[PDB]
């Protein structure tokens, strides 16, 4: 049979994600939410759009979490600390033992928090409880480098690490173009700029829209690592992993470079962090350990 | 150099028209709206998803008509009569001097009226003024056709006339899987079921979303109509175009089947309707007459 | 991942492989049994995996162990009499080897005589009838399509078409199953112009062989084969024409024939069974004969 | 729409119209000397068109005059000094009859030995350097990711690499410029491994001719080739190794070397210039004698 995945809130990211995943047509997708109608909706709206696009993909919305059963990828973006926590138990206790094979991938913020706390109400296996936020942030990163640079977006490659905003551990030095060093294209304090631009990114889209934040970018980062699962890309991607002394952290989510594949984080990389990059990974941990202790 | 698309409406259908549109990395595209912002954000959103997917296109939003110069396609999705009348003037008013030599695509409702006006102020030639409604009524409909009958939606094809929901002209016998009548496979009580549903189709995405109206269907239609123009494909597709006496109707924009390609309309398809069907299409066209005279 | 296992690595092999590659819809075995035709090929291929994007293992081998557990097998090592007894000994090897150790896939005959030779592997196999089919009808009416397109002025992505029987002679063309977005070809096309695609249709294959002068046609081909393999391992339910075993449809019992049906992960999962006019079963009773004349001197 | 003509309609002539097919890019126009040949191979690829769903025309030829206003010329017409005249005379023949009737268009040499080959192109047809240019770099840089990729045990889609030169010995590894994701190559893979990939891609090529026996490489070089065209008509201004018009880059002049590019609508659109360590230079240096002594033994 067909894969199956289910995406637990129909809002922006989430139903974007569906858009995203549909059109790659890889596996039935059901879209879940607390309010009635909205991911009925969203589903039927999409999945009439299949006959246009060529794509054979059964979009349904539910309200019912028993239509989440036996999924190999559950999404979660149904977060709006304290709100997202308990929303983020709910929907995690209801999913999880419905699907104990899937592999869990948390959107809500705050982020490295949450999918801590998904790790702990399933009981799943580490490695099939993540997060994303690296991949959106390095796309965000890789598409200001692409057009400074003025190259193809797919020549560019980046790796960075931590959370979001301040959280977020930039690594300019592990970022290429073809392979080749992007301080060979761009200058140090043009690439400060590009740093600080990606540290502000979402801030940014926020600030624009007024009323919402980002969902075009998110979504695609988080269909990005539910492929590379379903197909067992084994991609090498910044996510939100379980640590058991990696970069000197322990018991703590944090964003790492990962091989993701049909196993979840197949292996956690370690990369040879200098003492400037490891001063922003400590400062970037206690952060993040700030917001654990506080959940 | 790449092709252009503008659309005018950054709202849910014309966003997920970007959307759509990047994907296939069909030209740049410039998302404008009135609202300061928001088409900014989307554009800047859509633009960072880039990296992700692979596709090298430009995503840009904009207040300012000037950035629309030039468009090879110009797609309208601004409306909310009187006052989609109003909007849609000053749209095409200021869109069309910029970019004389491209293809309009309307989308705001009521559509067969407003792609009428849109061809008065634009003045550009008839064949270059369309509008986007039997694309979506059709996939509907196709979508309805697989899922009943328990086949791919990549099988199914269908073509149908006229407006929106009453004014919506069915031809279930111009309908076919494969090839093979679609009345080999569904009976005359359900197929009957299927197009009620296909009237209805849309009012049904709106009473399921609450708060607004159907958006990945209508876009992908009209992301579809954008292609088939930039590709010159020469699609078989219904069209809101302008009559000279096909089917017996002038002066007037209905649905009609259409060879679309990067002329426009460039053939309007004449089909052998018997008594039954032209007795629909005839009150079809008096109901889109009265909304065109009350323009 | 998915597993297809591609039994003869020559041009239609190799070609299909590169198709399903592109698509990334699982991992590929390329056999043969000439050492390192398969490998080479295999090797090429995957070395262009980085350029398109796609991650698929694409091996070759001359091992039939490498094929186990394979979800689909498709078998295109074929090279009158002569030309069933050839190729009817290339397919009793092939799938008497691959087979027993693929017992839960969907076998894709595509050697010819087609009809003929999926009747073999039905046999060879021991393998439910609606798991072994053979590829020949999406080629024809792929042709057939082509040509429609090509002179309605029209995209090919808006054309759709139904056939039956075999190849050449054997085929049943059927222009009253053919349309343009739900339009029937013939408002479209002139009876005579029409006459003419349909018997353009009959000789495409040979149309090809004349032009290459060695060889056969393998992009289109492959194609077809292709789709049907994505059928099965999407379980997409695709309508199309596949050479598939009858047990009374239009007539015909105990003999492959091309017909319509509903290719998904279960292979045929239905014979569709369309009311043909008097002209209509003409051509396909003249068509089941000399496809039963070809089974017979197979059976022999 | 956007056309792409095809000089010379074997393998990796043809296989490039297959990717570039698939791409639905532009209309192709497949030429070659044989009569048959290119026609056949088109219209089989045009007959699959109904099946993958693109648009695109696919014509074969044996007039030049059907060239004519191509957007890209693809030339692989191609067939010690032996090797080099005859290539000259073909590739001679090829350019000095197609240039002329699309004088806006990019070439894109494929024929061997390359580096020669593209630099007799851009002498025959006086077009500015930029718009000439040879496809080499992208496929052994693509042969070096496979190895990295299936090595290290991650995705093709997260390996790139940048190399120079020209092919086997003529080759400039550069591994440093290798990464997965933006971590050096180096990270991934030991130093003694990674010799031997450096090794296996040199000579790459030469593998695959060893397995097939008869003929060399068409899937990656084709694919390769087409990443080119698609950069070209797409105005992607991808950043690739391609056989450019030197004039001073890496102490070289008046010579065709592969070197790191931003490849647009406009052609090469930039030389990138990286700084290379003693060891590097020392390779590169000895690869432009070898790529010289060919280009002398051309101009003589
Ligand atoms: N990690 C990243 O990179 C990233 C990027 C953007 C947004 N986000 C986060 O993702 C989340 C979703 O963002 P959004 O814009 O889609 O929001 P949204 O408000 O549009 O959608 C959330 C949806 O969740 C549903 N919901 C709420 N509680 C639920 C429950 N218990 N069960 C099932 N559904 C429930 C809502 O009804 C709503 O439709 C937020 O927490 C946001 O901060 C993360
Ligand atoms: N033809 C079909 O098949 C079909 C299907 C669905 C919706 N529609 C119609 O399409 C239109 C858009 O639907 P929507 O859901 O995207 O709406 P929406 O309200 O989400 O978006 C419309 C956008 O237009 C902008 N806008 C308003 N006036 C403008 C002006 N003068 N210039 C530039 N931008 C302006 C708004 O600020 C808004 O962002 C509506 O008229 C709707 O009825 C047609
Ligand atoms: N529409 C159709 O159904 C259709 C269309 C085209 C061609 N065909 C048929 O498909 C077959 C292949 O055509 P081709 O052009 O690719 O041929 P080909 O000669 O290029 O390739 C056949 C390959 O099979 C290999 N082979 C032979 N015996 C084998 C065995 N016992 N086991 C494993 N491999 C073996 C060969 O060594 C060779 O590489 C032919 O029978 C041809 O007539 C069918
Ligand atoms: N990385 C690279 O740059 C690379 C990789 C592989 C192969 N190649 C080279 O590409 C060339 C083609 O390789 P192939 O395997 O496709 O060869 P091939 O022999 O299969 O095809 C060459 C085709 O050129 C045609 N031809 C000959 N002279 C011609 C002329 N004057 N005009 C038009 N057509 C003519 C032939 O008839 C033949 O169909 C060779 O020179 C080969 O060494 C380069
Ligand atoms: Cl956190
Ligand atoms: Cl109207
Ligand atoms: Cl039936
Ligand atoms: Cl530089
Ligand atoms: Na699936
Ligand atoms: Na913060
Ligand atoms: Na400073
Ligand atoms: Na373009
Ligand atoms: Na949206
Ligand atoms: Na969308
Ligand atoms: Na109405
Ligand atoms: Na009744
Ligand atoms: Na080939």
């Given at each position: 049979m067909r894969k199956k995945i289910s995406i637990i809130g129909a809002g922006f990211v989430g139903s974007t994600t569906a858009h995203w995943l549909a059109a790659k047509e890889l596996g039935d997708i059901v879209l879940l939410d607390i309010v009635e109608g909205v991911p009925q909706g969203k589903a039927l709206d999409l999945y009439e759009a299949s006959p246009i696009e060529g794509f054979d993909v059964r979009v349904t919305g539910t309200?019912?979490?028993?239509?989440?059963?036996?999924?190999?990828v559950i999404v979660v973006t149904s977060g709006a600390i304290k709100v997202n926590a308990d929303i983020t138990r709910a929907c995690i206790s209801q999913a999880a033992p419905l699907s104990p094979n899937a592999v869990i991938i948390m959107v809500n913020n705050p982020l490295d928090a949450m999918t801590y706390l998904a790790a702990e109400v399933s009981?799943?296996?580490?490695?099939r409880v993540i997060g994303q936020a690296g991949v959106l942030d390095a796309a965000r990163y890789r598409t200001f480098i692409a057009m400074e640079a003025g190259?193809?977006?797919?020549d560019v490659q980046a790796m960075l690490m931590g959370?979001?905003?301040?959280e977020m551990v930039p690594l300019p030095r592990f970022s290429t173009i073809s392979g080749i060093p992007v301080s060979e294209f761009i200058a140090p304090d043009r690439l400060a700029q590009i740093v600080e631009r990606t540290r502000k990114g979402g801030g940014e889209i926020v600030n624009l829209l007024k009323t919402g934040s980002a969902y075009y970018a998110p979504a695609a980062a988080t269909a990005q690592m539910v492929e590379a699962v379903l197909k067992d890309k084994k991609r090498v991607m910044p996510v939100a992993a379980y640590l058991?002394?990696?970069?000197?952290?322990?018991d703590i989510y944090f964003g790492v470079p990962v091989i993701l594949g049909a196993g979840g984080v197949e292996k956690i990389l370690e990369l040879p962090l200098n003492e400037e990059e490891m001063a922003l990974l400590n400062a970037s941990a206690k952060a993040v350990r700030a917001t654990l202790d506080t959940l």
């Open positions: 309200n019912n979490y028993a239509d989440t059963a036996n999924s190999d009981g799943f296996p580490k490695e190259v193809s977006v797919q959370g979001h905003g301040d058991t002394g990696q970069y000197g952290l322990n």
